[PDB]
């Protein structure tokens, strides 16, 4: 059992009011069963696309989730992960630079 | 030097629930997917059939179709046999394929992990446990090796089918494998020492150089992050530099990448 690492970053330079794509890359976890959500102001984004799960040379699993988004300076965005290795969901916020 | 990797992930939760999903990679590009939900393998590239005729592809797929059902029943049987020492849930992963070289191009591999630990490989003409694997695998592997037909097929697939197919793939997918996508960069920081961050996104292929400079002098504290994938088969990388406030002036992030052709990105703080 390995705990997932979560990295959240944008596809393009984040410019306020301009449509973009936010990525949530979840890696280094085992077993493969996982639930990933992306949040806008703490609320689940319904349209989220997920890559096929895969695994690395060390046998740990990884997956990419992404969703369309428009940064502003009034909305927060996060990726939230539920996995057996952790007693509670892990949420990581997009830091507005990444 | 391309590696072709077929990755199988099988989960067995109990006797009435299991799934097997596969993804196939040529270097860092996905070429096939096969979900437990689908009857047939899906192409993720227009060129994913490589140089195989419709008929040869159909035969290869039929073999994988039979294999997927057989594999499932075999593991279910291996558990019945070995239980209680090994019971559900169970995760099995298989990594199989070949790596192509110059001249006559290849080495093949088939590695198997149980519960996330590498335990078995196919090598030479038979399955073998790797040194340090648990002794309960002894009988299952003897039972598996008793299937001479499977061994012959696996040897063929690894020694002959895999390199031939991959030669055709490299040929048919040449334009994509050699595509050039340009990075875009932008700067940021968090506010007394500031961490400066140079973000580079949208580049393909993976090799890139990113560095903080002050004129022509390289900033040795430049720390490169991991390569992170974008969903559109391009890459993302960031490079950071710890600085003292009132020192950012003069600093610049320089980006070199094959797609730029001499027109490096240089972004001044
Ligand atoms: C808890 C146990 C887990 C420990 C880890 C070890 C597991 C290693 C995985 C090896 C996968 C075995 C694959 C073998 C599949 C065969 O069952 C299949 C056999 O086909 C034929 O079946 C006939 C009846 O249907 C027999 O008669 C007949 O005999 C028998 O040969 N074999 C195949 O489907 C061959 C293709 C194997 C491709 C494997 C590539 C990954
Ligand atoms: C797919 O490709 C694999 C290689 O990746 C082939 O595997 C080889 O298969 C051959 C024959 O089936 C094996 O050759 C035999 O080697 C024995 C010694 O093996 C050891 O020593 C060598 C180094 O010399 C090591 O590489 C190897 O790992 C072992 O440690 C010999 O003792 C054998 O000779 C005896 O048998 C033959 C008949 O079979 C007689 O003619 C001889 O007189 C003698 O009695 C034999 O030479 C070889 O070991 C395998 N290689 C490996 C690395 O395991 C598969 O055969 C191939 N399959 C297909 C269908 O292409
Ligand atoms: C993965 O796919 C397999 C094969 O399509 C499914 O296996 C069947 O499961 C049903 C219903 O539970 C059984 O009654 C059948 O006998 C199984 N068929 C074979 C040939 O294996 C399986 O349900 C799928 N797994 C999941 C979790 O959806
Ligand atoms: C032992 C594999 C050697 C490779 C043989 C060539 C097959 C190329 C086609 C790739 C599609 C296979 C999809 C993965 C199936 C699986 O492993 O369950
Ligand atoms: C088997 O596992 C599945 C998947 O978690 C579960 O839904 C089901 O309740 C389990 N029990 C059985 C034996 O069906």
Short mmCIF file of C-alpha atoms and ligand atoms in Angstrom, two decimals:
data_model
loop_
_atom_site.label_atom_id
_atom_site.label_comp_id
_atom_site.label_asym_id
_atom_site.label_seq_id
_atom_site.Cartn_x
_atom_site.Cartn_y
_atom_site.Cartn_z
CA UNK A 1 0.00 0.00 0.00
CA UNK A 2 1.48 3.30 -1.27
CA UNK A 3 0.03 6.77 -0.65
CA UNK A 4 -0.70 8.91 -3.76
CA UNK A 5 1.15 12.10 -4.60
CA UNK A 6 -0.87 14.85 -6.20
CA UNK A 7 0.32 17.65 -8.48
CA UNK A 8 -2.01 20.31 -9.90
CA UNK A 9 -0.92 22.56 -12.79
CA UNK A 10 -2.34 24.34 -15.79
CA UNK A 11 -1.94 23.52 -19.49
CA UNK A 12 -1.39 27.17 -20.58
CA UNK A 13 -0.23 30.38 -18.76
CA UNK A 14 -3.09 31.19 -16.38
CA UNK A 15 -4.61 34.48 -17.55
CA UNK A 16 -7.72 35.76 -15.73
CA UNK A 17 -10.96 35.23 -17.64
CA UNK A 18 -9.22 33.12 -20.34
CA UNK A 19 -10.25 29.45 -20.84
CA UNK A 20 -7.55 26.95 -19.91
CA UNK A 21 -7.14 23.32 -18.76
CA UNK A 22 -6.24 22.31 -15.20
CA UNK A 23 -4.41 19.05 -14.66
CA UNK A 24 -4.33 16.83 -11.62
CA UNK A 25 -1.57 14.20 -11.80
CA UNK A 26 -1.88 11.46 -9.23
CA UNK A 27 1.08 9.12 -8.85
CA UNK A 28 3.00 6.59 -6.78
CA UNK A 29 -0.04 4.74 -5.37
CA UNK A 30 -1.02 1.09 -4.71
CA UNK A 31 -3.54 -0.55 -4.89
CA UNK A 32 -4.96 0.92 -8.13
CA UNK A 33 -8.47 1.59 -6.75
CA UNK A 34 -8.85 5.37 -6.42
CA UNK A 35 -11.42 8.18 -6.63
CA UNK A 36 -10.38 11.59 -7.97
CA UNK A 37 -12.51 14.76 -8.11
CA UNK A 38 -11.61 18.27 -9.19
CA UNK A 39 -13.24 21.09 -7.26
CA UNK A 40 -14.26 24.65 -8.02
CA UNK A 41 -14.86 26.62 -4.84
CA UNK A 42 -15.04 23.34 -2.94
CA UNK A 43 -17.72 21.95 -5.28
CA UNK A 44 -17.22 18.92 -7.56
CA UNK A 45 -16.71 19.73 -11.27
CA UNK A 46 -18.98 17.31 -13.19
CA UNK A 47 -17.16 17.18 -16.54
CA UNK A 48 -13.71 15.78 -15.43
CA UNK A 49 -11.77 13.64 -17.94
CA UNK A 50 -9.47 10.87 -16.77
CA UNK A 51 -6.52 9.27 -18.60
CA UNK A 52 -6.25 5.48 -18.73
CA UNK A 53 -4.54 4.34 -15.58
CA UNK A 54 -1.01 3.07 -16.08
CA UNK A 55 1.98 2.07 -13.94
CA UNK A 56 5.64 2.95 -13.69
CA UNK A 57 8.84 0.88 -13.68
CA UNK A 58 8.53 0.50 -9.88
CA UNK A 59 5.00 -0.93 -10.38
CA UNK A 60 3.25 2.04 -8.76
CA UNK A 61 0.19 3.39 -10.52
CA UNK A 62 -0.46 6.83 -12.03
CA UNK A 63 -3.36 8.63 -13.65
CA UNK A 64 -4.02 12.09 -15.15
CA UNK A 65 -7.35 13.95 -14.64
CA UNK A 66 -8.02 17.23 -16.38
CA UNK A 67 -10.83 19.64 -16.78
CA UNK A 68 -11.53 22.86 -18.70
CA UNK A 69 -11.38 25.92 -16.46
CA UNK A 70 -11.10 29.68 -16.52
CA UNK A 71 -8.96 31.17 -13.82
CA UNK A 72 -10.21 34.38 -12.20
CA UNK A 73 -9.13 35.76 -8.83
CA UNK A 74 -12.41 34.85 -7.18
CA UNK A 75 -12.41 31.06 -7.73
CA UNK A 76 -10.29 28.39 -6.04
CA UNK A 77 -9.58 25.05 -7.71
CA UNK A 78 -8.45 21.82 -6.12
CA UNK A 79 -7.93 18.11 -6.72
CA UNK A 80 -9.35 15.72 -4.09
CA UNK A 81 -8.23 12.08 -3.81
CA UNK A 82 -9.70 9.17 -1.87
CA UNK A 83 -7.46 6.10 -1.56
CA UNK A 84 -7.23 3.15 0.91
CA UNK A 85 -3.73 4.20 2.08
CA UNK A 86 -5.15 7.35 3.72
CA UNK A 87 -7.81 7.54 6.44
CA UNK A 88 -9.22 10.76 4.97
CA UNK A 89 -9.42 12.33 1.48
CA UNK A 90 -6.47 14.48 0.47
CA UNK A 91 -7.25 17.81 -1.19
CA UNK A 92 -4.60 19.86 -2.91
CA UNK A 93 -5.32 23.35 -4.15
CA UNK A 94 -4.08 24.82 -7.42
CA UNK A 95 -1.63 27.54 -6.34
CA UNK A 96 -2.50 29.90 -9.13
CA UNK A 97 1.00 29.87 -10.57
CA UNK A 98 1.35 26.19 -11.56
CA UNK B 1 16.04 3.67 -28.77
CA UNK B 2 12.34 2.87 -28.34
CA UNK B 3 10.76 0.57 -25.77
CA UNK B 4 7.37 -0.94 -26.51
CA UNK B 5 5.62 -1.84 -23.25
CA UNK B 6 2.30 -3.70 -22.90
CA UNK B 7 1.04 -3.15 -19.37
CA UNK B 8 -1.61 -5.38 -17.83
CA UNK B 9 -3.34 -4.54 -14.54
CA UNK B 10 -5.63 -7.21 -13.10
CA UNK B 11 -7.61 -6.86 -9.91
CA UNK B 12 -9.33 -9.81 -8.18
CA UNK B 13 -11.55 -8.57 -5.30
CA UNK B 14 -13.23 -11.92 -4.62
CA UNK B 15 -14.39 -14.99 -6.56
CA UNK B 16 -17.26 -13.11 -8.27
CA UNK B 17 -15.37 -9.89 -9.13
CA UNK B 18 -12.27 -9.27 -11.19
CA UNK B 19 -11.09 -7.04 -13.99
CA UNK B 20 -8.20 -6.87 -16.37
CA UNK B 21 -7.24 -3.66 -18.13
CA UNK B 22 -4.28 -3.01 -20.47
CA UNK B 23 -2.46 -0.04 -21.98
CA UNK B 24 0.35 -0.18 -24.55
CA UNK B 25 3.14 2.41 -24.95
CA UNK B 26 5.72 3.06 -27.64
CA UNK B 27 8.25 5.26 -25.87
CA UNK B 28 6.14 7.93 -24.18
CA UNK B 29 3.15 7.64 -26.59
CA UNK B 30 0.09 5.52 -25.92
CA UNK B 31 -0.71 3.23 -28.87
CA UNK B 32 -3.47 0.88 -27.61
CA UNK B 33 -5.88 0.49 -24.74
CA UNK B 34 -7.99 -2.49 -23.77
CA UNK B 35 -10.57 -1.98 -21.07
CA UNK B 36 -12.14 -4.93 -19.26
CA UNK B 37 -15.40 -3.48 -20.60
CA UNK B 38 -14.47 -3.89 -24.28
CA UNK B 39 -14.52 -7.08 -26.34
CA UNK B 40 -11.65 -5.82 -28.54
CA UNK B 41 -8.42 -3.84 -28.27
CA UNK B 42 -8.70 -0.12 -29.18
CA UNK B 43 -6.24 1.83 -31.28
CA UNK B 44 -5.24 5.14 -29.69
CA UNK B 45 -3.25 6.21 -32.81
CA UNK B 46 -4.20 6.00 -36.52
CA UNK B 47 -1.03 3.97 -37.02
CA UNK B 48 -1.53 1.56 -34.11
CA UNK B 49 -2.02 -1.43 -36.46
CA UNK B 50 1.60 -0.84 -37.61
CA UNK B 51 2.27 -2.86 -40.78
CA UNK B 52 0.05 -5.89 -39.92
CA UNK B 53 -2.73 -6.75 -42.41
CA UNK B 54 -6.37 -6.71 -41.25
CA UNK B 55 -6.18 -10.51 -41.01
CA UNK B 56 -2.96 -10.73 -38.92
CA UNK B 57 -4.30 -8.07 -36.55
CA UNK B 58 -7.57 -10.01 -36.15
CA UNK B 59 -5.59 -13.22 -35.32
CA UNK B 60 -3.42 -11.50 -32.76
CA UNK B 61 -6.53 -9.96 -31.18
CA UNK B 62 -8.32 -13.33 -31.05
CA UNK B 63 -5.31 -14.74 -29.20
CA UNK B 64 -5.48 -11.90 -26.65
CA UNK B 65 -9.24 -12.42 -26.32
CA UNK B 66 -8.76 -16.12 -25.45
CA UNK B 67 -5.83 -15.22 -23.20
CA UNK B 68 -7.80 -12.65 -21.15
CA UNK B 69 -10.48 -15.25 -20.19
CA UNK B 70 -7.84 -17.96 -19.58
CA UNK B 71 -5.67 -15.75 -17.43
CA UNK B 72 -8.69 -14.90 -15.25
CA UNK B 73 -9.64 -18.53 -14.66
CA UNK B 74 -5.98 -19.52 -14.07
CA UNK B 75 -5.52 -16.98 -11.25
CA UNK B 76 -8.88 -18.03 -9.74
CA UNK B 77 -7.55 -21.62 -9.81
CA UNK B 78 -4.13 -20.61 -8.41
CA UNK B 79 -5.91 -18.99 -5.40
CA UNK B 80 -8.15 -22.08 -4.80
CA UNK B 81 -4.99 -24.20 -4.88
CA UNK B 82 -2.83 -21.98 -2.65
CA UNK B 83 -5.52 -20.64 -0.26
CA UNK B 84 -5.49 -19.71 2.67
CA UNK B 85 -1.82 -18.65 2.33
CA UNK B 86 -2.84 -16.39 -0.59
CA UNK B 87 -6.38 -14.99 -0.72
CA UNK B 88 -8.29 -11.93 -2.03
CA UNK B 89 -7.93 -9.05 -2.74
CA UNK B 90 -5.16 -9.65 -5.29
CA UNK B 91 -3.46 -7.36 -7.73
CA UNK B 92 -1.37 -8.78 -10.54
CA UNK B 93 0.57 -6.62 -13.02
CA UNK B 94 2.37 -7.78 -16.16
CA UNK B 95 4.88 -5.71 -18.08
CA UNK B 96 5.83 -7.22 -21.46
CA UNK B 97 7.37 -6.00 -24.68
CA UNK B 98 10.69 -5.33 -26.29
CA UNK B 99 13.34 -2.66 -26.72
CA UNK B 100 14.76 -1.95 -30.19
CA UNK B 101 18.42 -1.21 -30.91
CA UNK B 102 20.62 -0.42 -33.96
CA UNK B 103 21.53 -3.21 -36.47
CA UNK B 104 19.31 -6.15 -35.46
CA UNK B 105 16.98 -4.42 -33.02
CA UNK B 106 15.87 -6.26 -29.86
CA UNK B 107 15.61 -7.56 -26.31
CA UNK B 108 12.19 -8.71 -25.02
CA UNK B 109 10.88 -9.02 -21.45
CA UNK B 110 7.85 -10.27 -19.57
CA UNK B 111 7.81 -9.33 -15.89
CA UNK B 112 5.00 -10.15 -13.43
CA UNK B 113 4.31 -8.46 -10.06
CA UNK B 114 1.98 -9.83 -7.34
CA UNK B 115 0.60 -7.31 -4.83
CA UNK B 116 3.03 -4.71 -6.25
CA UNK B 117 6.17 -6.88 -5.95
CA UNK B 118 8.09 -8.28 -8.91
CA UNK B 119 7.99 -12.09 -8.47
CA UNK B 120 8.04 -13.92 -11.82
CA UNK B 121 9.42 -13.48 -15.33
CA UNK B 122 9.31 -15.47 -18.50
CA UNK B 123 12.96 -16.17 -19.44
CA UNK B 124 14.48 -18.41 -22.10
CA UNK B 125 11.77 -21.03 -22.60
CA UNK B 126 9.85 -21.06 -19.29
CA UNK B 127 8.35 -19.11 -16.37
CA UNK B 128 10.57 -18.65 -13.36
CA UNK B 129 10.31 -17.08 -9.99
CA UNK B 130 12.86 -14.34 -9.31
CA UNK B 131 15.34 -14.73 -6.38
CA UNK B 132 13.69 -13.67 -3.14
CA UNK B 133 10.11 -14.43 -4.29
CA UNK B 134 7.91 -16.26 -1.72
CA UNK B 135 8.15 -20.05 -1.79
CA UNK B 136 4.33 -20.48 -2.13
CA UNK B 137 4.80 -19.62 -5.85
CA UNK B 138 6.73 -22.86 -6.39
CA UNK B 139 3.77 -25.12 -7.29
CA UNK B 140 1.80 -22.51 -9.29
CA UNK B 141 4.92 -21.92 -11.48
CA UNK B 142 5.49 -25.71 -11.97
CA UNK B 143 1.81 -25.96 -12.90
CA UNK B 144 2.14 -23.03 -15.34
CA UNK B 145 5.30 -24.48 -16.95
CA UNK B 146 3.44 -27.76 -17.60
CA UNK B 147 1.57 -25.90 -20.39
CA UNK B 148 4.10 -26.39 -23.21
CA UNK B 149 1.74 -24.76 -25.76
CA UNK B 150 1.59 -21.47 -23.83
CA UNK B 151 5.36 -21.47 -23.45
CA UNK B 152 5.83 -21.94 -27.23
CA UNK B 153 3.35 -19.09 -27.88
CA UNK B 154 4.95 -16.74 -25.35
CA UNK B 155 8.45 -17.46 -26.83
CA UNK B 156 7.13 -16.68 -30.31
CA UNK B 157 5.37 -13.48 -29.16
CA UNK B 158 8.45 -12.17 -27.38
CA UNK B 159 11.17 -13.32 -29.78
CA UNK B 160 9.43 -12.87 -33.10
CA UNK B 161 6.05 -11.10 -33.03
CA UNK B 162 6.98 -8.22 -30.75
CA UNK B 163 10.10 -6.96 -32.63
CA UNK B 164 8.44 -7.41 -36.08
CA UNK B 165 5.28 -5.54 -34.98
CA UNK B 166 7.35 -2.75 -33.39
CA UNK B 167 9.48 -2.32 -36.51
CA UNK B 168 6.24 -1.73 -38.41
CA UNK B 169 4.93 0.68 -35.74
CA UNK B 170 8.06 2.85 -35.77
CA UNK B 171 7.69 3.05 -39.53
CA UNK B 172 3.93 3.77 -39.60
CA UNK B 173 4.01 6.23 -36.64
CA UNK B 174 7.15 8.07 -37.81
CA UNK B 175 5.50 11.50 -38.20
CA UNK B 176 4.02 11.40 -34.68
CA UNK B 177 7.09 9.94 -33.06
CA UNK B 178 9.10 12.75 -34.63
CA UNK B 179 6.52 15.54 -34.09
CA UNK B 180 7.80 18.80 -32.62
CA UNK B 181 5.52 20.88 -30.33
CA UNK B 182 6.85 24.22 -28.99
CA UNK B 183 7.09 24.97 -25.28
CA UNK B 184 5.41 28.08 -23.86
CA UNK B 185 6.90 29.54 -20.71
CA UNK B 186 5.76 31.85 -17.98
CA UNK B 187 7.23 33.11 -14.71
CA UNK B 188 5.80 33.33 -11.19
CA UNK B 189 6.88 33.48 -7.57
CA UNK B 190 5.66 33.46 -4.01
CA UNK B 191 6.59 36.22 -1.56
CA UNK B 192 13.02 37.59 2.99
CA UNK B 193 13.74 35.04 0.24
CA UNK B 194 11.62 34.50 -2.89
CA UNK B 195 11.20 31.24 -4.75
CA UNK B 196 11.15 32.08 -8.49
CA UNK B 197 9.40 29.63 -10.79
CA UNK B 198 9.79 29.15 -14.52
CA UNK B 199 6.97 27.03 -16.01
CA UNK B 200 7.42 25.40 -19.41
CA UNK B 201 4.47 23.63 -21.01
CA UNK B 202 3.32 22.07 -24.27
CA UNK B 203 6.69 20.72 -25.54
CA UNK B 204 7.23 17.48 -27.42
CA UNK B 205 9.50 15.44 -27.52
CA UNK B 206 10.55 15.18 -23.87
CA UNK B 207 14.19 16.36 -23.96
CA UNK B 208 14.38 20.06 -22.95
CA UNK B 209 16.78 22.44 -21.21
CA UNK B 210 15.52 25.04 -18.76
CA UNK B 211 17.76 27.26 -16.66
CA UNK B 212 17.75 30.48 -14.64
CA UNK B 213 20.47 32.87 -15.81
CA UNK B 214 21.86 36.25 -14.94
CA UNK B 215 23.18 37.29 -18.32
CA UNK B 216 25.40 34.40 -19.38
CA UNK B 217 26.11 33.00 -15.90
CA UNK B 218 24.16 29.84 -14.98
CA UNK B 219 22.26 30.01 -11.67
CA UNK B 220 23.50 26.87 -9.94
CA UNK B 221 20.55 26.77 -7.50
CA UNK B 222 18.18 26.06 -10.37
CA UNK B 223 16.20 23.00 -9.29
CA UNK B 224 14.33 21.20 -12.10
CA UNK B 225 11.01 19.57 -11.14
CA UNK B 226 9.59 16.31 -12.51
CA UNK B 227 8.31 16.01 -16.08
CA UNK B 228 4.50 16.11 -15.80
CA UNK B 229 2.16 15.03 -18.64
CA UNK B 230 -0.42 17.24 -20.31
CA UNK B 231 -3.55 15.48 -21.62
CA UNK B 232 -2.67 16.36 -25.25
CA UNK B 233 0.56 14.34 -25.37
CA UNK B 234 2.90 17.18 -24.56
CA UNK B 235 4.97 17.83 -21.45
CA UNK B 236 5.11 20.26 -18.56
CA UNK B 237 8.22 21.09 -16.56
CA UNK B 238 9.02 23.72 -13.97
CA UNK B 239 12.35 25.09 -12.76
CA UNK B 240 12.76 27.04 -9.53
CA UNK B 241 15.38 29.26 -7.93
CA UNK B 242 15.68 30.43 -4.36
CA UNK B 243 16.65 34.14 -4.30
CA UNK B 244 16.98 37.07 -1.86
CA UNK B 245 14.38 39.85 -2.33
CA UNK B 246 15.90 42.66 -4.44
CA UNK B 247 17.88 40.19 -6.54
CA UNK B 248 15.19 39.05 -8.99
CA UNK B 249 16.02 42.00 -11.24
CA UNK B 250 18.46 40.92 -13.98
CA UNK B 251 17.41 37.25 -13.75
CA UNK B 252 15.97 35.39 -16.73
CA UNK B 253 14.70 31.89 -17.49
CA UNK B 254 16.11 30.43 -20.72
CA UNK B 255 14.47 27.54 -22.59
CA UNK B 256 16.08 25.40 -25.27
CA UNK B 257 14.08 22.76 -27.04
CA UNK B 258 14.42 20.97 -30.36
CA UNK B 259 11.18 22.51 -31.77
CA UNK B 260 12.49 26.08 -31.44
CA UNK B 261 15.38 25.85 -33.96
CA UNK B 262 17.71 28.45 -32.49
CA UNK B 263 14.93 30.72 -31.25
CA UNK B 264 15.35 29.93 -27.50
CA UNK B 265 12.79 31.40 -25.12
CA UNK B 266 14.44 33.90 -22.72
CA UNK B 267 12.00 35.41 -20.20
CA UNK B 268 13.27 38.26 -18.03
CA UNK B 269 12.00 38.65 -14.46
C1 LIG C 1 -1.81 -16.22 -7.07
C2 LIG C 1 -1.13 -16.66 -8.37
C3 LIG C 1 -0.45 -15.48 -9.09
C4 LIG C 1 1.07 -15.66 -9.17
C5 LIG C 1 1.69 -14.90 -10.35
C6 LIG C 1 1.92 -15.86 -11.54
C7 LIG C 1 0.95 -15.58 -12.68
C8 LIG C 1 1.72 -15.28 -13.97
C9 LIG C 1 0.75 -14.94 -15.09
C10 LIG C 1 0.97 -15.85 -16.30
C11 LIG C 1 -0.21 -15.80 -17.25
C12 LIG C 1 -0.58 -17.20 -17.72
C13 LIG C 1 -1.20 -17.10 -19.10
C14 LIG C 1 -1.65 -18.35 -19.52
C15 LIG C 1 -2.88 -18.53 -20.13
C16 LIG C 1 -3.18 -19.97 -20.50
O1 LIG C 1 -4.18 -20.56 -19.63
C17 LIG C 1 -3.58 -20.11 -21.97
C18 LIG C 1 -3.81 -21.61 -22.23
O2 LIG C 1 -4.51 -21.99 -23.41
C19 LIG C 1 -4.79 -23.43 -23.49
O3 LIG C 1 -6.00 -23.74 -22.72
C20 LIG C 1 -6.63 -24.98 -23.23
C21 LIG C 1 -8.08 -25.11 -22.72
O4 LIG C 1 -8.75 -23.84 -22.86
C22 LIG C 1 -5.70 -26.17 -22.88
O5 LIG C 1 -6.21 -27.41 -23.40
C23 LIG C 1 -4.29 -25.94 -23.46
O6 LIG C 1 -3.40 -26.97 -22.99
C24 LIG C 1 -3.73 -24.52 -23.12
O7 LIG C 1 -2.49 -24.29 -23.80
N1 LIG C 1 -2.48 -19.61 -22.81
C25 LIG C 1 -2.59 -18.59 -23.66
O8 LIG C 1 -3.63 -17.95 -23.85
C26 LIG C 1 -1.29 -18.27 -24.43
C27 LIG C 1 -1.02 -16.76 -24.62
C28 LIG C 1 -0.26 -16.20 -23.42
C29 LIG C 1 0.03 -14.70 -23.59
C30 LIG C 1 0.68 -14.10 -22.31
C31 LIG C 1 1.19 -12.68 -22.57
C32 LIG C 1 1.13 -11.78 -21.32
C1 LIG C 2 13.40 -17.21 -27.56
O1 LIG C 2 14.66 -16.62 -27.24
C2 LIG C 2 15.20 -17.22 -26.06
C3 LIG C 2 16.39 -16.39 -25.52
O2 LIG C 2 15.97 -15.17 -24.93
C4 LIG C 2 15.57 -18.68 -26.38
O3 LIG C 2 16.08 -19.34 -25.23
C5 LIG C 2 17.15 -20.25 -25.50
O4 LIG C 2 16.73 -21.53 -25.92
C6 LIG C 2 17.83 -22.39 -26.26
C7 LIG C 2 17.38 -23.72 -26.87
O5 LIG C 2 15.99 -23.88 -26.65
C8 LIG C 2 18.76 -22.63 -25.07
O6 LIG C 2 19.94 -23.24 -25.54
C9 LIG C 2 20.40 -24.24 -24.62
O7 LIG C 2 21.34 -23.71 -23.70
C10 LIG C 2 21.78 -24.64 -22.72
C11 LIG C 2 22.61 -23.93 -21.67
O8 LIG C 2 21.79 -22.90 -21.17
C12 LIG C 2 22.57 -22.08 -20.27
O9 LIG C 2 23.75 -21.49 -20.83
C13 LIG C 2 23.57 -20.38 -21.70
C14 LIG C 2 24.96 -19.86 -22.06
O10 LIG C 2 25.63 -20.86 -22.80
C15 LIG C 2 22.69 -19.30 -21.06
O11 LIG C 2 22.41 -18.23 -21.96
C16 LIG C 2 21.37 -19.91 -20.56
O12 LIG C 2 20.56 -18.94 -19.91
C17 LIG C 2 21.65 -21.07 -19.61
O13 LIG C 2 22.28 -20.65 -18.41
C18 LIG C 2 22.55 -25.79 -23.37
O14 LIG C 2 22.91 -26.71 -22.37
C19 LIG C 2 21.64 -26.43 -24.43
O15 LIG C 2 22.35 -27.41 -25.17
C20 LIG C 2 21.70 -28.69 -25.06
O16 LIG C 2 20.46 -28.79 -25.76
C21 LIG C 2 20.51 -28.77 -27.19
C22 LIG C 2 19.11 -29.06 -27.75
O17 LIG C 2 18.15 -28.20 -27.16
C23 LIG C 2 21.54 -29.75 -27.77
O18 LIG C 2 21.73 -29.48 -29.15
C24 LIG C 2 22.88 -29.66 -27.03
O19 LIG C 2 23.78 -30.67 -27.44
C25 LIG C 2 22.69 -29.75 -25.52
O20 LIG C 2 22.27 -31.04 -25.13
C26 LIG C 2 21.07 -25.37 -25.39
O21 LIG C 2 22.11 -24.82 -26.18
C27 LIG C 2 19.14 -21.32 -24.35
O22 LIG C 2 19.66 -21.57 -23.06
C28 LIG C 2 17.94 -20.38 -24.21
N1 LIG C 2 18.45 -19.07 -23.84
C29 LIG C 2 18.19 -18.56 -22.65
C30 LIG C 2 18.81 -17.21 -22.41
O23 LIG C 2 17.51 -19.16 -21.81
C31 LIG C 2 14.33 -19.45 -26.90
O24 LIG C 2 14.67 -20.76 -27.38
C32 LIG C 2 13.65 -18.66 -28.01
N2 LIG C 2 12.46 -19.36 -28.50
C33 LIG C 2 12.11 -19.34 -29.81
C34 LIG C 2 10.94 -20.19 -30.23
O25 LIG C 2 12.70 -18.66 -30.66
C1 LIG C 3 -14.49 -7.94 -16.76
O1 LIG C 3 -14.85 -8.58 -17.96
C2 LIG C 3 -15.25 -9.93 -17.79
C3 LIG C 3 -15.39 -10.57 -19.17
O2 LIG C 3 -16.20 -9.78 -20.01
C4 LIG C 3 -16.50 -10.08 -16.88
O3 LIG C 3 -16.60 -11.42 -16.43
C5 LIG C 3 -17.93 -11.97 -16.34
O4 LIG C 3 -18.63 -11.61 -15.15
C6 LIG C 3 -19.98 -12.06 -15.22
C7 LIG C 3 -20.93 -11.29 -14.28
O5 LIG C 3 -20.33 -11.06 -13.03
C8 LIG C 3 -19.97 -13.58 -15.03
O6 LIG C 3 -21.27 -14.13 -14.82
C9 LIG C 3 -19.26 -14.13 -16.27
O7 LIG C 3 -19.13 -15.54 -16.18
C10 LIG C 3 -17.87 -13.51 -16.48
N1 LIG C 3 -17.36 -13.88 -17.79
C11 LIG C 3 -16.09 -14.21 -18.10
C12 LIG C 3 -15.95 -14.90 -19.43
O8 LIG C 3 -15.08 -13.98 -17.40
C13 LIG C 3 -16.36 -9.23 -15.62
O9 LIG C 3 -17.60 -9.08 -14.97
C14 LIG C 3 -15.74 -7.85 -15.86
N2 LIG C 3 -15.43 -7.27 -14.56
C15 LIG C 3 -16.01 -6.18 -14.08
C16 LIG C 3 -15.64 -5.81 -12.67
O10 LIG C 3 -16.82 -5.47 -14.70
C1 LIG C 4 3.70 -11.02 -24.68
C2 LIG C 4 3.37 -9.75 -25.47
C3 LIG C 4 4.33 -9.55 -26.64
C4 LIG C 4 3.79 -8.53 -27.63
C5 LIG C 4 3.05 -9.19 -28.79
C6 LIG C 4 2.59 -8.17 -29.83
C7 LIG C 4 1.20 -7.63 -29.51
C8 LIG C 4 1.06 -6.18 -29.97
C9 LIG C 4 -0.37 -5.66 -29.84
C10 LIG C 4 -0.61 -4.94 -28.51
C11 LIG C 4 -2.02 -5.16 -27.97
C12 LIG C 4 -1.97 -5.99 -26.67
C13 LIG C 4 -2.84 -5.40 -25.56
C14 LIG C 4 -2.41 -5.97 -24.20
C15 LIG C 4 -3.09 -7.33 -23.91
C16 LIG C 4 -2.75 -7.92 -22.52
O1 LIG C 4 -1.53 -8.01 -22.23
O2 LIG C 4 -3.71 -8.26 -21.79
C1 LIG C 5 -16.93 -8.87 -4.46
O1 LIG C 5 -16.24 -7.65 -4.74
C2 LIG C 5 -17.06 -6.62 -5.28
C3 LIG C 5 -16.20 -5.42 -5.67
O2 LIG C 5 -15.80 -4.68 -4.54
C4 LIG C 5 -18.19 -6.26 -4.30
O3 LIG C 5 -19.08 -5.32 -4.88
C5 LIG C 5 -18.97 -7.52 -3.90
O4 LIG C 5 -19.89 -7.19 -2.87
C6 LIG C 5 -18.00 -8.59 -3.39
N1 LIG C 5 -18.72 -9.76 -2.88
C7 LIG C 5 -19.12 -10.82 -3.59
C8 LIG C 5 -18.58 -12.16 -3.14
O5 LIG C 5 -19.88 -10.74 -4.57
#
